[PDB]
Design a protein around this ligand. Structure first.
Ligand SMILES: Cc1ccc(C(=O)O)c(C(=O)O)n1
Ligand SMILES: Cc1ccc(C(=O)O)c(C(=O)O)n1
Ligand SMILES: Cc1ccc(C(=O)O)c(C(=O)O)n1
Ligand SMILES: Cc1ccc(C(=O)O)c(C(=O)O)n1
Ligand SMILES: Cc1ccc(C(=O)O)c(C(=O)O)n1
Ligand SMILES: Cc1ccc(C(=O)O)c(C(=O)O)n1
Lengths: 155, 155, 155, 157, 157, 155
């Protein structure tokens, strides 16, 4: 039984995230999306989880959970030791590499990186929110349910 | 009827910026420098605009305006669809690429990048202010007008 | 009286190149595609030129010429002093920056960089030829005319 | 029935490669090491030598096997009923080229590429730099598995 | 009478920093570790604590001394009759910003900056990531000198 | 007694190289420029050494020697264990980092990197030769004696 964790704040989840989720779910027996919260954003943890579940309805081996603290503890507590992280334009890859090597050192957890599809490579949660805030149309970059909710939080 | 917008916070404008303005003005019929308002910074919007106008008096086809909201709206509301953005040492080019792809997606606006001259490649508004704050000589890196104004804000 | 030169070996021209040509032609009055002759490659200079002309028939202000020697001489001998160069995934941008600074130094020619559309961001002439050689379908990544011609050279 | 292909020329395999093999084998049900051969440029080691050196240093990995191939990697992957590649990263990896290839490979064949950074201890070895250093007498013994080191010295002498 | 300044906030010093200190001390007649303080943002450790942790882990380096400062690094360097900075590189270093600062520092004061990559074993530690990991219970004991680790745990508790 | 080696092929030496030499000579008691030859260029080893000696006449603690084989052997044979390498626009820094870590591992030799001055940041031996070959003026980027010799080898 294989498995990996897909971590992020997902505030909100984007089609870039979904693409990575789909690829993880296709290649591992079990995937857990870890909605990591800070001491703070647009959507509550519960809202974020609901948006991810709506978007991943077709992935029966993927589940969504909230987490706090050390990512490697979240991973190991669930009997796993792999992380799958997406890459997009603007990803701080050098910092991701630093964290991957740190996470392997402190807990033996591996990190696999996968680039999101070119079509979704320039969306990020932060930039989608910024563009939407000023009336820009990011509907092609987000799940339909997310775009609906986003307009709600803004209007 | 060609034209481009050169965006930035310009707090203050540097010779690195001016070099890019000059190239934009040499290659496009019309250039608009967009002083993006959203942090208070050191100089007020009017001061920034004044300093740019003073530094670009020899560029007849260049004008300076402030703007709020999406950069692409600023560009499109003036009948243009090109941005000219400078590169220097320390530019977050990956983030600029993300924004360029987003801006093309949401509004059909092209972004052209040009590297500033080597002599001005290590100045930024932030680093110039920091160095000058602590008594370093940045007079070779700023328009003569700007430099005096900066000393004024500090003393 | 604005103008830019779009240089490359174009062996063959891709949709990534065409996207850049289209943007250059939309933002400058005059565009010259420079097919730089110096390795024999797959297609002859005349074939490359033909394929570009066929692919750019809807761009009235664009023309195609071959060139030898310094790119800056090609540009300056046509009364221009701007280069428009595309960026894709795998572009050696650091080398392009070195050449841009050198070209500005020796001839006062500016270089503007523009990222090609995400959909065409992973095609290159080399990778398209390699993949097609081994039977991969690159028809979505090349002008329809070019694609048939490529199949011809292979079969 | 999960699985991935770990590709390379492995001329010779290094401890950097082996680290990546081990991680892939720990995270996928089956792993195939694809020894990709250019039929028009011989390397230092023959295909059989390359395969033997990998097998001898992966004997502890029961779910890993080693096969050679040529042409499109995605055909090698798909003909084995898989659609994942696991590729290692080290210092000096042309990551932008690997990203270009990954996006191309997804486009033409639907195959996903997962990248994993090799351990810091092995992050500066590559087949090419190991061969170069050894050619001029440098000690690369700590960077290559035992199945490789003296065979490499043999080729050079 | 050669010499270099090794700058940082060292809040706390890591084994990555110490590796760089050791290399600088091996290659220059004198080394000064400059503990640069922002007078308007306190860190986890006080200046005296930072200096004590560095001193305790550099006792074997007779030609290294430790001093705090603020403001322009190049003034700290020049007022000591030196004109070289030795700065470490690790994974996640903002090298482009360091390059910008190096060119600025040469321009305004004639001071040269030499960069050296820390050892692979210490390449993924940083003061900030060590503090973050330790805050949430992760084991960073192998990445920090003995002068630091339990003091860090003390601050966090 | 401190010391470092500055390695390269220097075919020919540029002002970028000279800037690095000067900084090494200012910071180390002894500097050795290692002219490394391959199994191949424009100038012979002896010509390269002569051009470097002409350019470094004012550096009494710097000497020039040819070398073959492992750079770390060259360094250690001379009682040293430091390398000083310059950085310019277009340097393959990731490969330099790989070699530095390899060189430290196999022989305990440290590598210090220093960026050349912005004015000399876009010259390289290869690009200077290429530009000069087609009649471009690189005289501001090379020592006077070198530029003289370069015109000689070309004409
Ligand atoms: C698909 C994807 C991958 C990575 C990131 C990230 O860098 O945090 C993002 C995002 O910024 O929201 N998105
Ligand atoms: C000439 C120039 C080009 C780009 C930038 C930028 O990254 O915003 C700057 C700056 O930081 O002030 N300056
Ligand atoms: C669209 C595009 C932009 C740039 C390049 C290049 O790096 O030369 C290429 C290509 O490799 O064919 N293509
Ligand atoms: C461990 C490892 C990962 C990737 C590579 C590569 O860039 O091909 C190598 C190598 O070059 O031999 N090695
Ligand atoms: C060894 C080392 C070198 C450089 C840095 C840095 O980027 O400031 C660090 C750190 O962040 O603590 N550490
Ligand atoms: C000053 C300098 C530093 C490094 C290099 C290099 O990368 O080889 C060069 C060059 O290319 O000739 N020049």
């Amino acid at each position: 039984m294989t498995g990996a964790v897909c971590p992020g704040s997902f505030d909100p989840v984007t089609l870039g995230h979904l693409d990575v989720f789909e690829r993880a779910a296709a290649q591992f027996d079990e995937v857990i999306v870890a909605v990591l919260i800070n001491p703070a954003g647009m959507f509550t943890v519960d809202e974020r989880i609901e948006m991810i579940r709506e978007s991943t309805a077709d992935l029966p081996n993927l589940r969504v959970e909230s987490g706090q603290g050390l990512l490697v503890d979240f991973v190991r507590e669930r009997g796993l030791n792999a992380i799958v992280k997406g890459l997009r334009t603007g990803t701080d890859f050098e910092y991701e590499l630093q964290m991957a090597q740190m996470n392997k050192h402190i807990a033996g957890v591996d990190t696999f990186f996968v680039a999101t599809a070119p079509a979704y490579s320039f969306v990020s949660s932060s930039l989608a929110k910024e563009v939407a805030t000023y009336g820009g149309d990011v509907s092609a970059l987000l799940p339909a349910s997310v775009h609906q909710r986003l307009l709600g939080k803004l209007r």
